[PDB]
Structure 1
């Protein structure tokens, strides 16, 4: 029937051609010359001539030549429970979250502080260094499939950057947040009203809408941003602490925020919360809060996580004006 090498060659070539189709048509940004693409396409068709078994309706060469890229928001499973975080709006609410941690975890706590972005939660699963799937939060177990749209974001790399320091992991799930910069938010709104479309009330809604598009070409045009702030199921990584895990993401080419600091005790946490209270509007995107998490992975595990929220993290949300 088909030889092992026959199938290997075909899948390899189909995948390469399929991907270039995505960049040229969907993202409108090809990474190879058109002439080269023509070479690849011919070879694919040649192979399909050679072997008619492989010719299928889903093949790049036959029945999806023009365009077969759509997003149907199919439910997809998250590798790890991705739960929403508990919120803390007062210093007093802080306090319980502060002491309780010290009761269970003890004195070797070391809380990580990160700015809280107000956009849409996005989960990426980056198997063998390739982006296999992007999905929304949903109910925490399963979410909608917006992989195609996630591939168009400038900030989201398709492939991980290999290096000796941080070897590319096997199966890697990295959570993050998609958002718009204030300037771009206004810009997109202007473009929208220019073409008769209704503008968005805020950047959160604007980003959510721009991501949730049935046709990913639409999302490719908008300047969505991304910042990775969490790790889901990871294989072959074993990052000791959360902050150390961030170096890994950095080495792999993933977007990370530059306003993350480590606070040894509650007092350090309070400073950051206070500081970002006066300076949070200086940032180019919407920051509604400060996120505090126990940095040590091993310690985190002990504290565990409740039915719908982690016990090792809490988000301080600044009061609305």
Structure 2
């Protein structure tokens, strides 16, 4: 009986949540809240309209995260480090000696909490902490409260994406301010985000302002991407939140320019970064480079001093 208004509230809340948490709102907080409250009331009085990907999932539930030890479908990578220009030049020289001139993708390394996010038939069904890279903790219920994480992708794929969960600097500072006025302060946004995702109650996680950036996928089968940068664009089209500050560059001069630029611009960002990740862009060329015992030979994490 209430299908039209429920579908209308789904459509409006999903569009508004995307514009705010992924993109410029077209609507004030008061309008989002009013529509959210109305959907919550319909679902309380008519629970047959509840759905797995309802916008009301974002406020958190009674069901708690299990924190069960769960294996990733595919182990998560450990990156080798660079600490100066020389290290980047060595890494570039190792690659060009072996496979020739390559295009690099450069990305900001968010000072966040690494997660794997598993999608089955396009639905978000499992979110794990990175753990030891092989085994993680099940924090699905808490991750579901993060609006930047789609509950349902644009296409019904079976994929495991890798992301960095984080707390925006402004939200971190405002939280410590509330603590200062009333409690012990969090040391940094990373610790505040970790505290928020360790809650027994997802309703507590929901009242913290968290976001994510997706940086990779486990499996490129259902992707038409030939490169890391194309794969991130494809992820955008599928409904995920990626970091827009990535760049394709032709050579090591380009990589150095991007590091020097972001050294000077990192204070301007709304999140903490601890580095810059540089990767061979082409997927076939990443494959050609292969791995060491621990780490890809086609990627490196430059770390700020």
TM-score (norm 1): 0.76
Structure 1 residue 78 corresponds to structure 2 residue 72: yes
CA shift for structure 1 position 268: 0.8
Structure 1 residue 147 corresponds to structure 2 residue 134: no
CA shift for structure 1 position 42: 10
Partner of 2:179: 192
**Consecutive unaligned residues in structure 1, runs of 5 or more:** 1-28, 44-66, 162-167
The count of aligned residue pairs is 261
1:314 pairs with one of 284, 295, 300 = 300
Q: Is the 8 A contact 2:103 2:248 kept in 1?
A: yes
Partner of 1:276: 262
**Consecutive unaligned residues in structure 2, runs of 5 or more:** 1-35, 51-60
CA shift for structure 1 position 102: 0.9
Partner of 1:113: 106
Q: Is the 8 A contact 1:175 1:229 kept in 2?
A: yes
Partner of 2:11: none
**Residue-by-residue CA offset, 1:245-285 (whole Å, 9 max, x unaligned):** 11111111211111111011111111101111111111111
Structure 1 residue 132 corresponds to structure 2 residue 118: no
| Rounded Cα–Cα distance in structure 2 between residues aligned with 1:298 and 1:225 | 31
**Residue-by-residue CA offset, 1:193-249 (whole Å, 9 max, x unaligned):** 455x42201111111111122211111110011111111234422521111011111
RMSD in angstroms over aligned alpha carbons? 2.2
SS across alignment from 1:258: coil
Partner of 1:100: 94
User: CA separation of 1:41/1:239 partners in 2, compared to 1, >3 Å: closer, same or farther?
Assistant: same
Partner of 1:34: 41
SS across alignment from 1:315: strand
> Which structure: larger Rg?
1
Q: Is the 8 A contact 1:124 1:175 kept in 2?
A: yes
CA shift for structure 1 position 33: 5.4
Q: Is the 8 A contact 2:62 2:201 kept in 1?
A: no
| Rounded Cα–Cα distance in structure 2 between residues aligned with 1:244 and 1:230 | 11
SS across alignment from 2:200: coil
User: CA separation of 1:110/1:217 partners in 2, compared to 1, >3 Å: closer, same or farther?
Assistant: same
| Rounded Cα–Cα distance in structure 2 between residues aligned with 1:292 and 1:173 | 22
SS across alignment from 1:233: coil
SS across alignment from 1:121: strand
1:232 pairs with one of 210, 218, 229 = 218
| Rounded Cα–Cα distance in structure 1 between residues aligned with 2:38 and 2:122 | 19
Map 1:161-180 → 2, pairs under 5 A:
161=154, 168=155, 170-180=157-167
| Rounded Cα–Cα distance in structure 2 between residues aligned with 1:172 and 1:91 | 36
User: CA separation of 1:31/1:104 partners in 2, compared to 1, >3 Å: closer, same or farther?
Assistant: farther
Partner of 2:31: none
CA shift for structure 1 position 313: 0.5
| Rounded Cα–Cα distance in structure 2 between residues aligned with 1:169 and 1:264 | 35
CA shift for structure 1 position 182: 1.4
**Which 4+ runs in 1 deviate beyond 4 A?**
none
User: CA separation of 1:70/1:98 partners in 2, compared to 1, >3 Å: closer, same or farther?
Assistant: same
